[model samples]
Target: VVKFGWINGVLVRCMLNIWGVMLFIRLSWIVGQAGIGLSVLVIMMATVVTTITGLSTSAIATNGFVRGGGAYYLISRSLGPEFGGAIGLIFAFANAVAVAMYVVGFAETVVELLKEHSILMIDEINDIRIIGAITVVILLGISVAGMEWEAKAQIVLLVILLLAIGDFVIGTFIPLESKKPKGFFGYKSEIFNENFGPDFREEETFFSVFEIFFPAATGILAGANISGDLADPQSALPKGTLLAILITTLVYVGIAVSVGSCVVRDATGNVNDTIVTELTNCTSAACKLNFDFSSCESSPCSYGLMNNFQVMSMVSGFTPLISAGIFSATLSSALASLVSAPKIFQALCKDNIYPAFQMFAKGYGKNNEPLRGYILTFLIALGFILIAELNVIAPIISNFFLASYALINFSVFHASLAKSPGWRPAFKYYNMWISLLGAILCCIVMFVINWWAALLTYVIVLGLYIYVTYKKPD
Candidate 1:
């Protein structure tokens, strides 16, 4: 039976909308304003890496029979059900956990915005948690309905987001930097030179940039999940993936350089602010009657998280409309995850690796939605939310996510190189070259995470695969 869920074009559009359009684009602008000189090169490499990887994934999807979401579907068909099932569970769980992080991030930012405008009554951690969790529940509740409603909502959200952003860009760009000093580049050479030293490993900086940018591409993987729903996976998927990567890369590079360049350094010349935060600081300095010494720092720019609204407001010289756009962007990011996590869950269930999730994986009978999967995904996401809030882990969770993600690309290469008739797909890239390039890219990226961390992750996956294999009940 041919089931039509999303229209031919809607799936890919929605996928990009959720993946990182608003978050990356806006954030990158802040990066640009900060005067991160290497952003241009970083963004360019990122574009190629992301597009190629995205295309490879599209090729793999067209060549195989995939269902549910990501890891589980791919592994099951390649390395046997047991291996597939185990990693599938991990992927679903990880993805779900990631949902909560997005939700919490969204909730906190929203609450902060309300507080900034004197709109919120209470602003406690507990209160914020409740609001965030509730917001997530609402999104999930809506998601169990189906992709149709979610798509409609996203379209509205994207439109509002675009209009608000455009208005702010034009209205605020002038006064945003009216007072602050503007220059073609960083104020001093020592800023870049001092950090790296004379012979400070070019490898480190280059690799670090690549590592940061690589995830930008992996965001496009959502396109693979929608393959079954595509009008033509072979044609549509490749084009969409390529287009998404290029767009995202350009945005990432452009925004980062724009924000980085705007950074106003002090006598000491140290800039360590989050992209958005730094921009807000810039505007704050500009608006000051006496140079805003209190808000301004000796070494302008911060790499720490800033209120997204505040960032937009500052970059656009406190344009209320842009602030509104920031709100839409952050909230859309959270909601987009709500729409996607369940799709991954339902896909896993279809593979039979994720318990009896199949019953619900079939989706809400009303609108062909995966009601139960959505619920289950939220529950798992809530756990991650707690983990994120508690600050329980020593290292970054995203690192592990990245490590595992790298393996996935390599797996694509490995699986592709294997001769299989079922794997036939018409793509500009052949399986061997696709897989080889994927490996090369992944290996290079593995460096930014550091050799030790990469090896450790490798050992862990290997150990888990072995245990799952030998421990299987006959």
Candidate 2:
């Protein structure tokens, strides 16, 4: 059994993990807009998946006595450390690449926005990549220096972000016209069922509402890997996992209502864009004091304040200046994932699973940041960026993530039902026979959404596993 301990400070634990959960809600706004019909079902499934998967993770953490590695560690311990590392390697690398893209885009617009204010007094700014790379280097340097500082940074980020979001929500609600669209509640069934209906998940499909659970559940479970850093492994870990997802679900649902009220529904009654888009529309209206005015006319809409003077491009209507105050909100979540990934990397490195990759888990700074793991993760991310640049593997990566989801979901089911030699959780779920039915439902939905992609990714991963086993004689 994995002996449980709350290693990382509490602030690091919650802010880092919870940010993903909350952000996921906003991500769902894409669902409501794209596939209204599948929105409700997918959101419901994601919520259940997030909640139950969290509990199951808590149970596994209690029994296996594990630390962070996100899915890599969880799957590794249950399946085998090497297999876990391989997967973790891909996951961490892929995520780093994704974040780089995010930050890069964020960085570019921020500068442009600040330029609007003439804060930098600069004539020109480079593309987002340069800005993002600088941001990564700065953050990484601070993290390598110490976890305490990182935690403090995350605290400040969380506070500022919460305040901003609170203000946004409160301001929207206070004596404001109910801006929700005409058929938001009904849009889910109408868009998903009526339009997509039988072929809702067709490959040509743009809006992947029913498929949202794959990413959302994976995101919710993101915190589970922090078992080692939580306050009370048995209590806080599970509570954090469940609470994070539940809160995120409510947030998603709330955004749905907010988007519905505020957005201009299309002729088909389906939302044409994401909640960010809707918010931008509403924000434009609010700024003009003309609810009837379109958001497309808003000036300098893409610019956001990055730091005090450094501005970046805005994501959603939330500006970078606004986001800078809460930058740690996203940074901490990344850190939490970083915290988990290293432990998993180390666990696999002990056996030399990957070439030249064993150092990440073994060597560490005083702050317990896995120096090697962090560097290796950066390289992997860079590799993905290069691949993305090529545009050859971009689609493959999405498919890979979907496949990883299936594998992990299967692994979870195995762990949930298996009788293991470990400390059984004090709180065991009963009537899981019913729960398995739900799992089956989840699997069916996953298959419907991206079965071919899922199958191809799984086969390749499994094949690699077999090849590695033979090559290394593990």
Candidate 3:
């Protein structure tokens, strides 16, 4: 319940938000699949996107008072009303809708873990939705209560997450007789060399891998989402956000190299032991127990970096700590998104850009808690939670996030281009090319991920802009 200046208000919340479920579950697989060199490339490529956007966002945050709607606030003021207003809705709904995805991701992972222990779950998808909706309700309560409680909650989760990562780093080097046979090779050169080449699981190429990894750590603006809460946002935003991105990137690179160096794709390295032997004509190329790599009927489970979803746990010192980390990661991330979306909505409403949103504009405390926006955010997330599956929705929300970053860069770029006397910012490292390059990267990434989703996102943006222009509140 401590009020924070930059540490908790911006740095802690922002860093934790970026290091979500992917860092725990998907990262090892990334290294195992792509190998050390290519894995590092993927991580750096994601960093490139995040870093450029960081510079772009950092510049805007320094210019003026970054009120409630952090991203929308910065963009609306720096860009123009139409772009800001539409992007405000786009960014707000992206956070709101994406909440269900994070919640659902946690629920599904927890359910799967329980099932691993012979805990029978009914129609798995049905159980997942039930748990997801429950989690959303809990989050809405925390968010509505206010940022103080959310602050305490995230700080505690951060502790758990850091400890979980600690377990793996220590576990990687300290040789335990039990783990060495199972792929913990104690950073041996042979193991490193063995995993240094691309394996390309399921025929996925480098760009496909990059596309998946690009947004894995793109929580670049989570700190800005709560700019209204900071006492000195103009000073804190750039420092907190850039540091978080830098720290997260270093962690990602370490993970790629350390993981790719220590553990290998398959510990056994016997081609015969790694495939399903039951099905006729089922070579390793054609047959498998599931989508993930698994050994067949008579042989023991030979899972390593390739197939183990809880690969970090398997490779860590204390398995339970990794599980705890996973819980903290999944839930805290959802909590941040829940709280963030409401703030964005509240800001958008205060502008009265959309007449129907006037109710959500009202503030309720010294901090101006978005009580009504919380309700609206909760309801929208619940609607998506009830639907349960987010395969189609997930990519589109991702597109909106990329789109938001694009406009933020464009804001900085355009602002510099116009060179208004008011465009002065405390942050001085940026030039127009840096910001425009960020915009181009985001646009390229959007189309590469899903062409249809990219086009549809622009359509929504254009539609919202046109409608807002027609109203012409000014």
Candidate 4:
């Protein structure tokens, strides 16, 4: 395996993240739910919280030696092995779920893009599972090939990705004529009304929107996850992590603002005021021509790129190259998680946290990759692919991540405030109050976004902690 310094680490992290690719698609949904006002607030708030988490991670990494387990190692050392075990269990599972999520997202993009080109028969959308499954197998193969190859693959992916992003940003400034029944380039107040919905809070409000959009900012940890591969964990983790966050924040905020500017409300009215004609609402072939039901819906039906592609098509004349960017963005993320989850599991097993997990602790081959842990990750991913919906899985991933972010912040806060002599870190810009604030903010957001999901994840992990405590394997 090649040793990664900060620059290589940051490149990998940016490729895995550039979540702005996904965010570009979801920004409209975020605006639809929170309205332009709170949407800006939500975007900034998420970025701030993540940056705070990164700062805490940097502080921790700089304080002492860091090895495998990344965030898990930091928390375990500061919070104790029991807390680390609980957080590690959820962290590893979250990454596994993320692998599946990205695959599903990629599959959905393929099916949608093909449908637009008439390459797919009408009936094929129902079969995204087949595509998703195949995607998983291919990614599994890539993960097995090892990090050296993965890093090289990321280089090619990032180049096309930057091109696609540039197209989207430039597309925002290009003007298009308001067209057909869909008004391809036009936005009506009715569009906003329907998107926001009646009892909109039930359908498209803050928490619901936050849950969908937060994943876009979740990639700051990509570098941290590969802490074991870094030549200098302390220096590399902080520099790579902070730089990635800064770039993504600018990209995300820029996209949100651009979309808001591009989307025009044709007629002023209360967001709830909108009426749908019988023909406009009907799906039958007997229905009138020129009305595209997909975008003309009386309610919001599409999320992700399907909706945004129209905006892209209007500006760029239906370029499918954007789909390649999507594929690369998602595939790299899945590969990163596939690489990371096992490393976390291997670290856990090495610590002998559980009597039964000793086998997962072993790494196979010359590079000492986590083959057994990869198998476990693949199985977990496959299970989700078979049954879990992306929307259903998104909030759970958010919860697990928030928990880990909360713990990371808490770990640093404890070390700093307690004045542990060993807490002196090269990353001296970090503050104890900031760390505490970050932890508090994460906990608040966890419950604010979805209390039930947060409660369930925390309870399950805590129960695991109790069980591990009794096992006392190490």
Residue runs of model 3 more than 4 Å from their true location after superposition: 1-3, 268-302
How far off is residue 351 in model 1, in Å? 3.4
Q: Which 10 consecutive residues of model 3 have the lowest summed lDDT?
A: 285-294
Q: Tens digits of per-residue lDDT for model 2 on 241-334?
A: 6665666667666654444343322311123323332333343222222222233322322211101122111212344434553354555555
> Model 3 clash pairs?
none
Instruction: Estimate the TM-score for candidate 1.
Output: 0.74
For candidate 3, the TM-score is 0.91
Residue runs of model 2 more than 4 Å from their true location after superposition: 1-40, 67-73, 108-126, 175-207, 210-217, 229-231, 265-330, 351-358, 383-395, 398-409, 415-425, 434-452, 472-474
Q: Against the correct fold, how does model 2 do in TM-score?
A: 0.69
Best by lDDT: 3
- For residue 257, model 4's alpha carbon misses the true position, in angstroms, by 1.2
The lDDT-based order of candidates, best leading, equals 3, 4, 1, 2
- What does each candidate score in C-alpha RMSD? 6.9, 8.4, 4.9, 6.2
Q: For model 3, how does the per-residue alpha-carbon lDDT over 1-474 read when each residue is reduced to its tens digit?
A: 124688777866887788877888888777777888778777877788888888887888778776577677787788787898888889888888877777888887888888886785678868988877778888877767766778889898898888888888998878564553356657767666566677677777897677667656766678788777677767877788888988989988887788877775655434443333345554342132212233333454567776767767877677878888888998888888888888887888878878765577666677677788888888888888888778766676778889898988888888899877788878877767888888998999889878898999999999998999898786
Give each model's whole-structure lDDT: 0.52, 0.49, 0.77, 0.69
What does the lDDT come to for candidate 3? 0.77
State how far residue 245 of model 3 sits from its true place (Å). Answer: 0.6
Q: Which 10-residue window in model 4 sums to the lowest lDDT?
A: 265-274
Candidate that beats the other on lDDT, 1 or 3, i.e. the better one? 3
